[PDB]
A paper describes a structure:
Using conventional single particle analysis cryo-EM method, we solved the structure of purified recombinant CRL2FEM1B to 4.08 Å resolution. The asymmetric super-complex is shown in Fig. 1A,B. The asymmetric super-complex consists of three protomers, but only protomer 1 and protomer 2 were well resolved. Protomer 3 was partially obscured and requires a lower contour threshold level to be visible. A single protomer of CRL2FEM1B in the oligomers has a conformation similar to CRL2VHL with the notable exception that FEM1B adopts a different ‘elbow-like’ fold. Protomer 1 within the homo-dimeric CRL2FEM1B super-complex acts as a scaffold stabilizing this auto-inhibited super-assembly. In addition, extensive hydrophobic interactions are formed between the N-terminal domain α-helix of FEM1B (residues 269–284) in protomer 1, and the C-terminal domain ankyrin repeats (residues 546–588) of FEM1B in protomer 2. Thus, the C-terminal WHB domain of CUL2 (661–728) and RBX1 in protomer 1 form a ‘forceps’-like conformation, ‘clamping’ the cullin repeat 3 of CUL2 in protomer 2. In this way, the ‘head’ and ‘body’ of protomer 2 are completely fixed by protomer 1. Furthermore, the loop connecting α-helix D and α-helix E of the CUL2 cullin repeat 1 (which was not resolved in the previously reported X-ray crystal structure), appears to bind the C-terminus of FEM1B through hydrophobic interactions mediated mainly by Tyr125 of CUL2 and Cβ-Cε of Lys469, Tyr472, and Cys521 of FEM1B. By using blue native PAGE together with glycerol gradient ultracentrifugation and MP experiment, we obtained evidence indicating that the trimeric CRL2FEM1B disassociates into a dimeric conformation after neddylation.
CRL2FEM1B is an oligomeric E3 ubiquitin ligase composed of CUL2, FEM1B, ELOB, ELOC, and RBX1. FEM1B is the substrate recognition protein of the oligomeric CRL2FEM1B E3 ubiquitin ligase that has been implicated in sex determination, apoptosis, colon cancer and Alzheimer’s disease. Cullin-RING E3 ubiquitin ligases (CRLs) are multi-subunit complexes composed of a catalytic Ring-finger protein, a cullin scaffold protein, substrate adapter proteins, and a substrate recognition protein. Here, we describe for the first time the cryo-EM structures of oligomeric CRL2FEM1B in three different states as follows: unneddylated CRL2FEM1B, dimeric neddylated CRL2FEM1B complexed with BEX2, and monomeric neddylated CRL2FEM1B complexed with FNIP1/FLCN.
Author numbering:
A (entry chain F): 189 to 470
B (entry chain A): 283 to 522, 525 to 745
C (entry chain R): 23 to 57, 68 to 102
C-alpha cells in the first residue's frame, strides 16, 4: 500500500488489483468447504457454535494482518458464505426451537439471522403463533365459577413471562415487542363466549369486587398497583366504550349506597383512566 | 446515651417529651435506641446455636419484639420514628450470618413451617397452628432472601403432597393465601398450580377409572392401579438409568397411555419410575408378607419369581438399570435380609449372585421402608443453593436489561442502584455479581459501553 | 397374588399448547367459521373436522408435523 504514496487519484488501486481479489476468492472457497464439511456432520446447535467460533477468529486474524480498510468486505464475504447459504435449513428447524426453547440456543438465532436481511422476518411471525396459542390455553381452561380474578392475573402472567423471555434473549428488537402487542390484543377479544363483550363487562365485575367496601381487605396502596396493572390489560381491549357504559352503572350503585370503601380510591380510579383515554371517557 | 442503658420509665417519659419539645433532640435518641436494640437482639439470637430445636430461633425473637413493642406503646406513645428504628434494628438480627457461613435462617424457617404442617406434630390444634403461623409470617417479614425460602418450601410442600403427609389442604391453602398477601401472587403462582394439580389428580383418576369401565373389552390388569398426573411447569422434578419396567406393569402402562391419548390428545407422558412405589406380596414364606417398595426394588423381587438365585448380570439385563442405583437397591434389599448374597465378599460386584431368603421373618406382615424424603442430605441443599444462584444470575441479567431499555441511556451507578431497588424484596444481591452479569450481557451484545464514557452504557438495539 | 402400584405421570409438549394449529380456537370449542365435531385423526393429533377439512383441501400437508394427516 505504501509504494503508491504520492499518487493523487486512487491510491489503493494497486493494493486492490494485486492482492485483494485472490484473497477474497480463496477465503470464500475455503469457507464454503468448511461450511459444507461442518454441515455434513455437526448438529444444529453444534453448527451454531462453530460458525460463531469461526466468525470470532476471522476478526482477530484480519485485524492482525490486512489493511484497516478491508475488514468489512472480508467479514461480509465470510458472512455471505456460511449462514446465508444454509439459511433455509436454519428456518426449518426454528419451529421446534421456539416452541420449547433453550436460552443459549435460540438466542444465537437472533445474532446469526440479524446479518442476513431476508432471514429475520420469518422468525418474528413464528413467535406470534406460539405466544398467542399459549394464551388460549390460559383462557380456555378458566372456570366460570370465579371469572373476575382469572383474567386479571392470568394474561398478565402470560404477558410478564414473555416480556421476561424476549428482552433477556432477543436483545429486545423493537419489531419483536410489536409482535407481542398484536398477538396479545387478539387474545383478549374473542367471539367464542356466548355473551358478546364478555371480558369487558367482567372488567367491571373485577372493579365491582374492588368497588365493594371489603372491610377484610388488602392494602389500598397495592390496590392501586392492581389498577395500575389493570390498565395494561385495558389497552389491549378494543371495545373501550362498552366498558364505560357498564362501569358507570355499577359505580353509581356503589356510590349511592356508599359501597365504595374510600372516596380517595375512586378519585385515583378516575385519575388513572384520564391518562388512559380521558376527555369524554372520563 | 447512658440513661437508655439503665432506664427509668418516668425519667424516660420526661426526657422523651422534652426532646420532642425541642427540634433536634430526637435523632440521638433514635440512633442510640436502634443500636441498643440491635446489640440486645444479637445477644438474644447468639445465645443458642445448633440444639436440634429450630423454634427457639423464631420464638425468642418474637418475645424480644413483643417486649419492645409494649414499651414503645407504653411510654413512647408509639411514635412512627421509633417503629421504623425498631424495624431497622430487628432487620439485622434475622439477617445475621457467621463469617464464611451462608444464611441458614430461610432454611430454618422453612424447616419450622414444614414441621408444623407434618403429621408428626400431633395434638396441635388448627387454631393454634394458624396463630403460630401468623407469628411466623410476622417473623418472615424481616427476611431478605425470600427466594431461597420459596424454593425450600416448594420442595418440602412437594414432598408432603406426593405422600399425603399434610394436615389438611385447607391449612396449606390458608398458608398460600397468607403468603400471597405477604409477597404478591407471583411468589405463590407455582405453589397454587401445585395445589390445583393435586386437587385435579383425584378427578383424573376418576375419569381414568370411568374409561376403564367403559372399554369395549373387559380388561383384567391383574394389579390394583393408582396413578397421579403432574405438570412439568411447577413440579421440581426436572432430573431424568435406562430402567426397564417389569412385564406385569406393561399392560397397565399401555392401557393408561391409550386412555390419556384418547382423553387428553397430544399430551406426551413421561414416567418417573424412581418415584413410583407399590405393594408386593411374598407367599413363598410360611406367612404371606407385604412390603411397600419402589418400582426398582419391586423389579428385583419379581426377577426371583422365576429363579431362586439370580446373578448380577441377569438382574442388570432384566432391569437395564445402571450400576450405582442397582447396587444401592440390592444393598437396601439385603439390609432387610429379604435376599442373601451368595458371595463371601461384602462388596457387591458383577459376579455377585443373590438367593431368595426362604428364612426371612418380620415383626410386621405389612412393612415399609422409611421415607428418606424427610431425611436431609447435605448435597441436596447445596444443589438447591446452586439452582437459586443461577436463578438470581438470570433475574439480575433481566433486571439490568429492563432498566437499560427503559432509560435507553444510563450510568453504571444508576443501573446498579435501580437493580438494587428492584431486587431488594426478592433477595439480597451483590455488586460483584451485578458486574459479572453486566459483563456477560456485554459479551452477548445486549448493551455497549458508551463511547463518551465507559461508566455509561447504551442499548445496542 | 395381589399387587398395588402407585405411579406419577409427567406431561409436556401438549397439542393444547397450540390447540388447533389451523385456527385460533380451543381443542374443545368451536372453529372460527363455525362460531360441534371432534374428528380424531390417525395422525395422533386432534383438530376440528371443519379445520382439517378446509386446510386439507387447500393443502394436504399437516402444518405441525409437515406431513399428511387424516
Ligand atoms: Zn379449530
Ligand atoms: Zn366446528
Ligand atoms: Zn397429524
Amino acid at each position: 500500500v505504501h509504494v503508491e504514496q504520492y499518487k493523487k487519484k486512487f491510491p489503493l488501486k494497486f493494493y486492490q488489483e494485486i492482492f485483494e481479489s485472490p484473497f477474497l476468492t480463496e477465503t470464500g472457497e475455503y469457507y464454503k468447504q468448511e461450511a459444507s464439511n461442518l454441515l455434513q456432520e455437526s448438529n444444529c446447535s453444534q453448527y451454531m457454535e462453530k460458525v460463531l467460533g469461526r466468525l470470532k477468529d476471522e476478526e482477530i486474524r484480519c485485524r492482525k494482518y490486512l489493511h484497516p480498510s478491508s475488514y468489512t468486505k472480508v467479514i461480509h464475504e465470510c458472512q455471505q458464505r456460511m449462514v446465508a447459504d444454509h439459511l433455509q435449513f436454519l428456518h426449518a428447524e426454528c419451529h421446534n426451537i421456539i416452541r420449547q426453547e433453550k436460552k443459549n440456543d435460540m438466542a444465537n438465532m437472533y445474532v446469526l439471522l440479524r446479518a442476513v436481511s431476508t432471514g429475520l422476518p420469518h422468525m418474528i411471525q413464528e413467535l406470534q403463533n406460539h405466544i398467542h396459542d399459549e394464551g388460549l390455553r390460559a383462557t380456555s381452561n378458566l372456570t366460570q365459577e370465579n371469572m373476575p380474578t382469572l383474567f386479571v392475573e392470568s394474561v398478565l402472567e402470560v404477558h410478564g413471562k414473555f416480556v421476561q423471555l424476549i428482552n433477556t434473549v432477543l436483545n429486545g428488537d423493537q419489531h419483536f415487542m410489536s409482535a407481542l402487542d398484536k398477538a396479545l390484543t387478539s387474545v383478549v377479544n374473542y367471539r367464542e363466549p356466548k355473551s358478546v363483550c364478555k371480558a369487558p363487562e367482567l372488567l367491571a365485575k373485577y372493579c365491582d369486587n374492588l368497588l365493594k367496601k371489603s372491610a377484610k381487605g388488602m392494602t389500598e396502596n397495592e390496590v392501586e398497583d392492581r389498577l395500575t396493572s389493570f390498565i395494561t390489560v385495558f389497552k389491549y381491549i378494543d371495545d373501550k366504550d362498552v366498558f364505560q357504559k357498564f362501569y358507570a352503572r355499577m359505580l353509581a350503585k356503589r356510590l349511592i349506597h356508599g359501597l365504595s370503601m374510600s372516596m380517595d380510591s375512586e378519585e385515583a380510579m378516575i385519575n388513572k383512566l384520564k391518562q388512559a383515554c380521558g376527555y369524554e371517557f372520563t | 446515651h447512658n440513661i437508655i442503658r439503665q432506664e427509668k420509665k418516668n425519667d424516660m417519659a420526661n426526657m422523651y417529651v422534652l426532646l420532642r419539645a425541642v427540634s433536634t433532640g430526637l435523632p440521638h435518641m433514635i440512633q442510640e435506641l436502634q443500636n441498643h436494640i440491635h446489640d440486645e437482639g444479637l445477644r438474644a439470637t447468639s445465645n443458642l446455636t445448633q440444639e436440634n430445636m429450630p423454634t427457639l430461633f423464631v420464638e425468642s425473637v418474637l418475645e424480644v419484639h413483643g417486649k419492645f413493642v409494649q414499651l414503645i406503646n407504653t411510654v413512647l406513645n408509639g411514635d412512627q420514628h421509633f417503629m421504623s428504628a425498631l424495624d431497622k434494628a430487628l432487620t439485622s438480627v434475622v439477617n445475621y450470618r457467621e463469617p464464611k457461613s451462608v444464611c441458614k435462617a430461610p432454611e430454618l424457617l422453612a424447616k419450622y413451617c414444614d414441621n408444623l404442617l407434618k403429621k408428626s406434630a400431633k395434638g396441635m390444634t388448627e387454631n393454634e397452628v394458624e396463630d403460630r403461623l401468623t407469628s411466623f409470617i410476622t417473623v418472615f417479614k424481616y427476611i431478605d432472601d425470600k427466594d431461597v425460602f420459596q424454593k425450600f418450601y416448594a420442595r418440602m410442600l412437594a414432598k408432603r403432597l406426593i405422600h399425603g403427609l399434610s394436615m389438611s389442604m385447607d391449612s396449606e391453602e390458608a398458608m398460600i393465601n397468607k403468603l400471597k398477601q405477604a409477597c404478591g401472587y407471583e411468589f405463590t403462582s407455582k405453589l397454587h398450580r401445585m395445589y390445583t394439580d393435586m386437587s385435579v389428580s383425584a378427578d383424573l383418576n376418576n375419569k381414568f377409572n370411568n374409561f376403564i369401565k367403559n372399554q369395549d373389552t373387559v380388561i383384567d390388569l391383574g394389579i390394583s392401579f393408582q396413578i397421579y398426573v403432574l405438570q412439568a411447569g411447577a413440579w421440581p422434578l426436572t432430573q431424568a438409568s435406562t430402567f426397564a419396567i417389569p412385564q406385569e406393569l406393561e399392560k397397565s402402562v399401555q392401557m393408561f397411555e391409550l386412555f390419556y391419548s384418547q382423553h387428553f390428545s397430544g399430551r406426551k407422558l413421561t414416567w418417573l419410575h424412581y418415584l413410583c412405589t407399590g405393594e408386593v406380596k411374598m407367599n413363598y414364606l410360611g406367612k404371606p408378607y407385604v412390603a411397600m417398595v419402589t418400582t426398582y426394588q419391586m423389579a428385583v423381587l419379581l426377577a426371583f419369581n422365576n429363579s431362586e438365585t439370580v446373578s448380577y448380570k441377569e438382574l442388570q439385563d432384566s432391569t437395564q438399570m445402571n450400576e450405582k442405583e442397582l447396587t444401592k437397591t440390592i444393598k437396601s434389599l439385603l439390609d432387610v435380609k429379604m435376599i442373601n448374597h451368595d458371595s463371601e465378599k461384602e462388596d457387591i460386584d458383577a459376579e455377585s449372585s443373590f438367593s431368595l431368603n426362604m428364612n426371612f421373618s418380620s415383626k410386621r406382615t405389612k412393612f415399609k421402608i422409611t421415607t428418606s424424603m424427610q431425611k436431609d442430605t447435605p448435597q441436596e441443599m447445596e444443589q438447591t443453593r446452586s439452582a437459586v444462584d443461577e436463578d438470581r444470575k438470570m433475574y439480575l441479567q433481566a433486571a439490568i436489561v429492563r432498566i437499560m431499555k427503559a432509560r435507553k441511556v444510563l450510568r453504571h451507578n444508576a443501573l446498579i442502584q435501580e437493580v438494587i431497588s428492584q431486587s431488594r424484596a426478592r433477595f439480597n444481591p451483590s455488586i460483584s455479581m451485578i458486574k459479572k452479569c453486566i459483563e456477560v450481557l456485554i459479551d452477548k451484545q445486549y448493551i455497549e459501553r458508551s463511547q463518551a464514557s465507559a461508566d455509561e452504557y447504551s442499548y445496542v438495539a | 397374588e395381589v399387587k398395588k402400584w402407585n405411579a406419577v405421570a409427567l406431561w409436556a409438549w401438549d397439542i393444547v399448547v397450540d390447540n388447533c394449529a389451523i385456527c385460533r380456537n380451543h381443542i374443545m370449542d368451536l372453529c372460527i367459521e363455525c362460531q360441534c365435531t371432534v374428528a380424531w385423526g390417525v395422525c395422533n393429533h386432534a383438530f376440528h373436522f371443519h379445520c382439517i377439512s378446509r386446510w386439507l383441501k387447500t393443502r394436504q400437508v399437516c402444518p405441525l408435523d409437515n406431513r399428511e394427516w387424516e
